[PDB]
Amino acid sequence: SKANVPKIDVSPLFGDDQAAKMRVAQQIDAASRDTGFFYAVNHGINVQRLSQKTKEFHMSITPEEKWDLAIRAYNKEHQDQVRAGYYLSIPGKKAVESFCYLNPNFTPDHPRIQAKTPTHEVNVWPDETKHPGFQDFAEQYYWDVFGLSSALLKGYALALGKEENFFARHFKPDDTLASVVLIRYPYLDPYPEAAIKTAADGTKLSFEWHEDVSLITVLYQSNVQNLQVETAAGYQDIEADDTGYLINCGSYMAHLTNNYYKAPIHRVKWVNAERQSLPFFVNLGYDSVIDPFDPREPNGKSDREPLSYGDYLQNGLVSLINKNGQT
Ligand SMILES: CC(C)[C@@H](NC(=O)[C@H](CS)NC(=O)CCC[C@H](N)C(=O)O)C(=O)O
Numbered sequence: 230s231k232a233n234v235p236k237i238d239v240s241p242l243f244g245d246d247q248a249a250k251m252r253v254a255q256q257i258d259a260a261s262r263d264t265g266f267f268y269a270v271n272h273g274i275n276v277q278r279l280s281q282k283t284k285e286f287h288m289s290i291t292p293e294e295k296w297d298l299a300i301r302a303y304n305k306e307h308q309d310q311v312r313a314g315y316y317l318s319i320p321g322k323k324a325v326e327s328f329c330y331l332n333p334n335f336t337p338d339h340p341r342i343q344a345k346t347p348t349h350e351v352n353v354w355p356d357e358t359k360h361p362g363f364q365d366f367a368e369q370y371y372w373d374v375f376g377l378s379s380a381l382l383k384g385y386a387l388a389l390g391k392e393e394n395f396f397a398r399h400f401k402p403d404d405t406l407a408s409v410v411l412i413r414y415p416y417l418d419p420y421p422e423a424a425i426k427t428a429a430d431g432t433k434l435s436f437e438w439h440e441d442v443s444l445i446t447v448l449y450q451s452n453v454q455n456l457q458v459e460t461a462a463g464y465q466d467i468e469a470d471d472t473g474y475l476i477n478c479g480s481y482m483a484h485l486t487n488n489y490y491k492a493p494i495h496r497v498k499w500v501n502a503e504r505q506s507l508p509f510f511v512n513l514g515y516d517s518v519i520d521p522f523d524p525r526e527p528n529g530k531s532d533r534e535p536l537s538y539g540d541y542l543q544n545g546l547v548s549l550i551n552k553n554g555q556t
């Protein structure tokens with residue numbers, strides 16, 4: 230019934246004790262070849278303050294403000310907002326709602342914003358007088374979770390037999406396509422039946438089976454159990470831990486390693502409870518290309534074609550919406 234999801238102390242990945250880093254890399258390897266999930270602990274981020282500031286924002290924002298920040302799927306006036314902005318709930322039909330923001334260095338003068346390159350957008354923010362300190366807190370949080378994610382990527386590189394900057398050299402403050410999503414899953418009475426899906430095995434869900442669109446995913450959630458992973462023994466429950474970050478690989482890592490580190494298939498159960506789900510999707514730059522390899526082969530060669538991260542991301546975000554629906 231419960232999935233094997235280990236707790237790994239990732240503090241050595243921030244320092245210079247190389248043998249201690251290798252012992253962390255082995256734990257990452259073992260979890261990646263088993264269920265595909267682990268919890269990162271002793272990460273240094275103040276997650277209680279993150280949860281308090283996010284709750285202050287979700288509970289004070291008003292309908293007027295949501296329409297003013299809405300993405301194109303909800304507001305035809307905002308044609309440049311495909312990824313960044315507010316994703317509304319549909320009272321009586323869709324329960325979840327969220328706020329997505331991208332790299333704070335994507336300003337109006339950034340070269341990729343000037344060129345209108347797909348997947349790059351300038352962030353939108355609420356009024357400062359109505360939400361004092363929110364934008365400054367949220368931009369500082371992007372850089373705090375970016376620093377954690379860079380330490381984790383050093384661990385994945387060592388686990389696969391590569392030098393510690395193998396993935397991190399493609400993950401940079403000036404051009405990362407990474408995103409933060411602040412998701413609110415509400416308590417509702419009565420709960421809308423159209424917002425509850427049912428799986429082939431009978432489980433009630435909020436989001437169906439999928440693989441993630443990311444290199445890795447770095448997730449904080451409230452203490453309410455909800456995720457399941459598909460293993461050889463069927464779907465198993467992932468326990469909650471509101472002091473750590475839940476980590477897993479996305480389908481760009483599976484392509485690069487020839488499915489040695491699989492992107493685990495997972496889904497979200499329906500739970501009638503007020504809770505938070507705050508993912509950071511670790512994406513590389515638009516032109517980043519890592520040549521595919523195969524760790525199970527002596528010469529490390531694979532028969533897969535190289536794919537740029539920008540091409541992967543644009544087609545992956547669309548495929549996920551077509552399969553499981555607009556969020
Ligand atoms: C489990 C969490 C990761 C969360 N799921 C999600 O966030 C789901 C599935 S991984 N993710 C997505 O739909 C992709 C959001 C991408 C984002 N708009 C962006 O432009 O980069 C949830 O709580 O439902």
Ligand SMILES: [Fe+3]
Pocket residue numbers: 439440441495
């Ligand atoms: Fe997911």
